[PDB]
Write a protein that binds this ligand. Structure first.
Ligand SMILES: CCCCCCCCCCCCCCCC
Ligand SMILES: CCCCCCCCCCCCCCCC
Ligand SMILES: CCCCCCCCCCCCCCCC
Ligand SMILES: CCCCCCCCCCCCCCCC
Lengths: 928, 928
């Protein structure tokens, strides 16, 4: 007999799947179909009293459910996914509005609804019962609202506001529901008892949720490679926190589960495995789906049971009159709440104008949370406090309100949104969507070439493949700003793809750019959306508060400045890249220079933050950079291991060992910031590329002590035109170079960084300093005298290397139009290639610059052919004029063999053998 | 009060997580800890009668579980993942052994155990009760055995055998358990009733499972983009099939759920979404985990309850004596089963030698299925048929046997496997593992370069990244065969990565190569493992049986020859590629030629199968190739959309629309083979690259009728030395070319394919046919006369194109050392480039062949410089001798600007500026 509850669950799930599948893209939630199906089924079982056989047995078994078991099983299932899929950064952006719409919004709605259904309803209810109903059906469902917002097409700001207030209204409304339910149960008669009950049920529930979250997050941090226990841990901790709060501490288990889910959303994005995230979210979304379906069908069944009893509440008239009165009361209470909070709602978080206010009012969808609360009231009814007729009325009214709100609100808020002209996609977003569709076309055609060379199967059919994918200026400052922001977006996309930034950092940066794309008429506001995430509050860790460890200080600083450092570095890198790209796309136009200077002025707060990090905490950026690099490394290893697993190339014991090793490395990363040894001067010397030339005897004068490598920002390294007093080794930081003498035209990013030595050209030649260096950051720089460098010129193997270093520096100096937007590791690869040749040239010879190569004069004089006799100075960067140069004096030279379309998309995009190629690859012809 | 069952579930889950986490890499299943914990907890609640408070309330609630509700909730949860994660191709490889170990193996074990516990046990049991116990504890658990095999390290053959027999022993043993349980309930007294009960409970259960599988698979095929209802559909169909079989049809719900899971494993790999697969498998594995944990803890609790009752079965002595007797009876019965079936087990499927037989005997792990069956017997005990003492004895004995088997078998089968020397990894697999680790090192270092250029954060710390990844001839015919098979493996990996083959096809091919890597001493046996998957049984569809539709015939042929065509084409392509690669790695050694000829002889059955497909069903390969190409295209689009979703670049409504479109395209693909229009002669002409030269007036002589494009294999197209009677257009198929006159040295793959026209050089010049063409397949070839081609020489825009086509053909003819292993679409790109120049050269001029380019003489004579005067013929392929050529007569020439390390891994793998580069990127220095 009890096995028929399994049948009830199975048939309810099948009906839920059928309703969800049939009512997709219909404006009509499948939940109204579930409620109607449950009501009809309960009418068959109870009103008409037909023989449903084993169907009716399960129906009756589930109708005899315990109220408190009902809540304990279903409410965590409903609410955990809503609270856990919460995205933390949009919530921190609109949290003032969230709490405003949650706590006082629910309080005002409860007051209005309770007063109205007290004064008007004919059931001679109490104030306790009236306010219990008011606070019951004051909880906007997060599942229904999220499902509505998926297909609604509203803006991200309004979608975030509505979703967050919907998921917090549940907590507040269930708190007040428990308060007034205990009141109706003859408790909480005094104000002091009210305060104690609220204090316990709210704060203790939040504390239990936080404690369980902390314990489970630490446990997850110590669970390395197991994606099954990571999800069953969420199940166990959720259903154990609910029990510990409701039964053991007497708190609110719902608030405990919601705080647990929010703690998981905040501090457990790195506690779970990366590939365990999708499975865990899918499982909890499915559990919410199953709980919602079961609650809707059970609520329908029990409504049919209760309103077709001896009393026949369904044939009383007053039931329906006051059901529609209750619906208009819902609408008026939501209007009152939004209007009262509007003067404060429009000033906090995201701006709320009158258009978003109408959608906020109209998206008052009631769902399975209110249904579950009223069902628990109905199932516990029949005693002296809440009569059976009253509990049946509560369930009937709540079910009718859920039905009416869904039908008249989910189906009509799309109309209200298309009206008021809030569904229109703005021009930058339309351009971006067209670019993405164009790139998808390019990917499809490229995949079609890559598989067109098959002799066994033959040729494919392009028309069929197309059928399956058949659903895919320089003077205006506004458009140039829009192109620049598109370039910044493209650079963020590129660095996310290459692994330089994580998905959360990428989302934050992309959201900032999307915000900035609406103010392209005014100055670039790209950093405005990043300012909330980049803050440096205080550094009291150096006031002896935590200098005794000196060891936890790095931990708190890194955990406290990790995401901000990533955001600042990514912002600066993307702005530099997009600035260079906009210079290449526009060339020399004054509007391009205006936007370039705008970006340079805007990128000052990020540099100031990075300076604060460098000064206050000199070791944090090393740890942060190391963590980023090894995180990307381990993700690349994970991708490789996933490909190995798919192909089945390795033994399942060896590939499992590799997977365990990489996943353990990732968990140990995201558990604890890397313990990076702070480099002294000795190991910074030995890690500099100049150290191969410097002998170990010169490397150990007390490990080159007595000099602090730190140089403050704005400190000149050496003045231009000065004598070669020495060279500078850049172990870290940024140095700017200025030179009016040098042909520094259009040097957009004059900069040298770590692993660079500056001044070798001058000390090796004796010529005055070619450029003016000033430190642009906290530079870890060491000075070695020219005597030490010049004394190294004994051997010819070291002279070659020193002149190649000089070649590097002058390549980034003499020719910055090509070699400034390249790393000085790629440039070292270019110079260090065996094909590159350093040559001392006797007077009267010729230098062989040619096609597909470049050369740079080091020391000497050269005169060309076919042009008026010119005495070219020693630094020349000798480039092919024709795509010549008799050696004049004793010469030195070395010859080297030397998503990005979003900025310039609809600009950067025949023969009788080109048409044949299209025929040979494709079917007839396609405009590739 | 009933809310305490939620507490029981939560604490049981927490204890299960703790046991699984603590006992990882311990040889000890966490399930023994679960059983011990449950026994101790039940002892506290029932024996010692301590006040456990709300813990004991949940304990007692779950102790009062219904037996049949217990089975209905837990057995589908346990067994669905085991039956659904079943891999179909290894099962079809060893199915004879599977059924042999499942049906008669379980029958023999049941007979032995029942007879032994009837004759020896002191409880005066019946034959019905004795055989009920024997068939209860005759079900080897699939969950425990799978978990053991994950860490065991046994071969794939033995692992597959053990896993499959374990997951089918459950079906057979639960069938016999239901039979003998109904017998003990006073039923099935006659042989005819026995036959009817077996017929119903087995065949009707299989039929219900098949029907539910068919319905749900069609439903899934019509569910496009919803990964949540796709998993809750599995839940609903599983728990509805169980109910429909057990309660409505009276069949076995367990057999129904297992056949449903096997149907999902077989015919629903394409019914679910690709990205829904991992989430669905994770969910069902977690459900099996939760059910197993709950069953073990509940079984412990109820054992403690039953053996500490008034009877005190735990203090009787006989309980323990016959528990250990029952364990030795388990061991002897398994020995008897394996020994009796060995003469047949060693001849069917995978060979079973005496070493794998010992592991087969010893891996007799009993688990949660036997525990659940005995718990259902215990919970239903207390009546006249099965006494309370008997049911308690059943549960106690089954729990003790599960405990003893786990402790003494899971912990010691690793020892038994390391003994007998079955844990040693063979040399080819060790080499492959070392190659994978080397490639992971290369990936890690490359990811370290790609993020070393950061001016804001600074430099990373390579030692830390390394710390996080610190766990990573030409004369022997055997080694050359091993290298060739490694090259075939690498090519399979490459085509899986590029999307030419799916993951199932890749797994089949890789398994075939792994099998072949053990017989490298003998001839290449790569095709031996593919022969089971490549069969062409019959084609009665053309005997008027189904020619009336002519429309379903393609559907059945494609669904029936899809995977076989993929396997054959991939095998032939990979063998051609690896043959060319082995020629490049070895050069000219006779051993390399021996292996090359071995591969060519081996690749004949695949070509014969493709010929059978081409002859019998001329339209199937077009459909199959189109489906493959569009599947890869849609997967690439999915990857692009996933990257778009991660970055948050598009609106969540537009990106959702793109995702829905691509996923709908994929579901419509895997639902129905593409409807590819069979090309007539007219559209094949218009789709050939020669059709741009051919005017529409020449294209429509009744759409060029009266000629059938089909040419049988072995039909010569034109003989060498013959007059240019015409040219041939290759729309499909393969043509081989032979020419002793031409310098065809080391032409390893002489072949032209679709989109190629052959003979233009001869008709344009009048020279005799340079090579001998014979059709190597069913070629769709058209003949156009030389008069039509020569009459096209009026314009100079068409002459250029015709001579460029001739250049293509002669590039693949004159110079096959470079241009035969390239598509004739890439070669068309090379020739059609604006940098390529066709030139008519007046007598006495010079031709400018240079570096980084190639040239080919078309028509005329040429004499070189510095070598004895040579009169080079018209086809020359004029290549730079120095890295010259005075035009002799009226000349024609055109000048063109012209995982793979697995085969040659530990063979294909400083300066003072190279050491500095390592310093500038890394920390000190790493051997890159
Ligand atoms: C006493 C009346 C019946 C009470 C039923 C208890 C609630 C059980 C709900 C189980 C839902 C299972 C589906 C979960 C799939 C992820
Ligand atoms: C007397 C009836 C007892 C019922 C006990 C049910 C315990 C289930 C707790 C965990 C359920 C989690 C999944 C819920 C999905 C809707
Ligand atoms: C009447 C005694 C208690 C019977 C309990 C019914 C079985 C409910 C099992 C629910 C398990 C929920 C966990 C599923 C999570 C995926
Ligand atoms: C009187 C007690 C009724 C209990 C009904 C439980 C129904 C649950 C059916 C579906 C359970 C699926 C998940 C099981 C995971 C172990």
């Amino acid at each position: 007999s009890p096995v028929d509850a399994v049948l009830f669950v199975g048939m309810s799930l099948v009906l839920g799947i059928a309703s969800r599948h049939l009512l997709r893209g219909t404006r009509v939630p499948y939940t109204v179909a579930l409620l109607v199906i449950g009501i009809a089924l309960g009418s068959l079982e109870y009103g008409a009293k037909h023989n449903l056989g084993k169907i009716g047995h399960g129906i009756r078994i589930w109708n005899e459910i315990d109220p408190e078991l009902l809540l304990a099983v279903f409410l965590p299932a409903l609410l955990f996914e809503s609270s856990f899929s919460m995205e933390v950064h949009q919530i921190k952006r609109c949290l003032g509005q969230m709490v405003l719409l949650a706590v006082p919004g629910v309080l005002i709605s409860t007051a209005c609804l309770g007063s109205l259904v007290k004064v008007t309803f004919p059931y001679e209810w109490d104030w306790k019962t009236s306010l219990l109903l008011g606070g019951l059906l004051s909880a906007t469902d997060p599942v229904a609202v999220v499902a509505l917002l998926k297909e609604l097409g509203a803006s991200k700001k309004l979608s975030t506001i509505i979703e967050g207030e919907s998921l917090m209204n549940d907590g507040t409304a269930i708190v007040v529901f428990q308060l007034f339910l205990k009141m109706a149960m003859g408790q909480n008669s005094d104000w002091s008892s009210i305060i104690k009950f609220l204090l316990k049920v709210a704060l203790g529930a939040v504390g239990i949720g936080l404690a369980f979250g902390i314990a489970s997050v630490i446990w997850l941090k110590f669970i390395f490679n197991d994606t099954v226990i990571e999800i069953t841990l969420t199940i166990a901790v959720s259903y154990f926190a609910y029990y510990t709060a409701q039964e053991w501490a007497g708190a609110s288990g719902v608030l405990t589960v919601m705080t647990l889910g929010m703690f998981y959303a905040a501090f457990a994005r790195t506690a779970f495995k990366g590939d365990s995230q999708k499975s865990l979210h899918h499982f909890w979304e499915m559990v919410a789906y199953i709980a919602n379906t079961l609650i809707f069908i059970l609520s329908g069944v029990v409504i049919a049971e209760g309103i077709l009893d001896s009393d026949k509440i369904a044939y009383q008239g007053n039931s329906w009159r006051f059901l529609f009165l209750l619906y208009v009361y819902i609408q008026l209470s939501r209007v009152v709440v939004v209007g009262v909070l509007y003067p404060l709602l429009c000033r906090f978080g995201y701006g709320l104008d009158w258009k978003e206010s109408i959608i906020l009012v109209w998206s008052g969808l009631r769902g399975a949370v209110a249904l579950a609360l009223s069902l628990s009231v109905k199932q516990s009814s029949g005693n002296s406090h809440i009569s059976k007729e009253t509990g049946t009325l509560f369930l009937f009214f709540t079910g009718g309100i859920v039905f009416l709100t869904l039908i008249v609100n989910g189906s009509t808020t799309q109309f209200v949104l298309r009206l008021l002209r809030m569904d229109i996609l703005p021009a930058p977003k339309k351009r971006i969507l067209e670019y993405t569709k164009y790139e998808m076309l390019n990917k499809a055609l490229r995949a079609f070439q890559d598989l067109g060379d098959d002799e066994e199967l033959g040729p494919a059919d392009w028309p069929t493949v197309e059928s399956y994918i058949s659903s895919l200026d320089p003077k205006s400052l506004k458009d140039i700003r829009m192109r620049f922001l598109n370039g910044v977006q493209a650079t963020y996309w590129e660095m996310l793809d290459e692994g330089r930034i994580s998905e959360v950092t990428a989302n934050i940066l992309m959201q900032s750019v999307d915000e900035a794309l609406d103010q392209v008429s005014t100055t670039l506001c790209d950093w405005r959306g990043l300012k909330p995430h980049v803050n440096f509050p205080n550094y009291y860790n150096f006031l002896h508060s935590k200098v005794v460890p000196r060891k936890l200080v790095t931990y708190f600083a890194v955990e406290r400045l990790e995401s901000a450092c990533y955001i600042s570095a990514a912002f600066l890198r993307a702005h530099t890249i997009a600035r260079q790209q906009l210079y290449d796309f526009l060339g020399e136009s004054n509007i391009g220079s205006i936007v370039i200077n705008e970006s340079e002025k805007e990128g000052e707060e990020a540099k100031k933050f990075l300076e604060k990090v460098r000064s206050s905490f000199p070791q944090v950026l090393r740890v942060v950079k190391t963590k980023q690099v090894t995180y990307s490394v381990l993700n690349h290893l994970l991708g490789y291991i996933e490909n190995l697993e798919k192909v089945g190339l390795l033994e399942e014991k060896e590939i499992a060992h590799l997977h365990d090793a990489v996943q353990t490395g990732l968990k140990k990363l995201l558990r604890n910031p890397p313990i990076v040894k702070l480099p002294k001067l000795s190991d910074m010397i030995t890690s500099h590329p100049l150290s191969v030339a410097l002998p170990p005897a010169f490397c150990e004068p007390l490990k080159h002590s007595k000099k602090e490598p730190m140089k403050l920002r704005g400190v000149t390294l050496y003045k231009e035109g000065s004598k070669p007093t020495g060279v500078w080794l850049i172990f870290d930081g940024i140095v700017k170079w200025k030179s009016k003498i040098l042909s520094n035209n259009h040097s957009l990013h004059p900069t040298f960084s770590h692993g660079s030595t500056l001044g070798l050209y001058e000390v090796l030649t004796g010529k005055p300093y070619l450029c003016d260096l000033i430190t642009d950051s906290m530079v870890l720089c060491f000075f070695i005298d020219s005597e030490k460098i010049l004394s190294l010129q004994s051997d010819s193997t070291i002279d070659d290397f020193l002149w190649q270093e000089s070649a590097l520096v002058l390549l980034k100096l003499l020719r910055p139009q090509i070699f400034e937007s390249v790393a000085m590791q790629e440039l070292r690869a270019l110079v260090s290639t065996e094909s590159s040749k350093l040559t001392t040239y006797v007077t009267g010879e010729s230098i062989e610059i040619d096609c597909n190569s470049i050369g740079l004069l080091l020391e000497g004089f050269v005169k060309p052919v076919g042009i008026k006799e010119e005495l070219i100075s020693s630094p020349a960067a000798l480039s092919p004029s024709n795509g010549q140069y008799i050696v004049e004096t004793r010469a030195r030279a070395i010859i080297f063999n030397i998503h990005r379309g979003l900025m310039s998309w609809p600009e950067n995009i025949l023969s009788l053998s080109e048409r044949a190629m299209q025929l040979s690859i494709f079917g007839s012809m396609v405009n590739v």
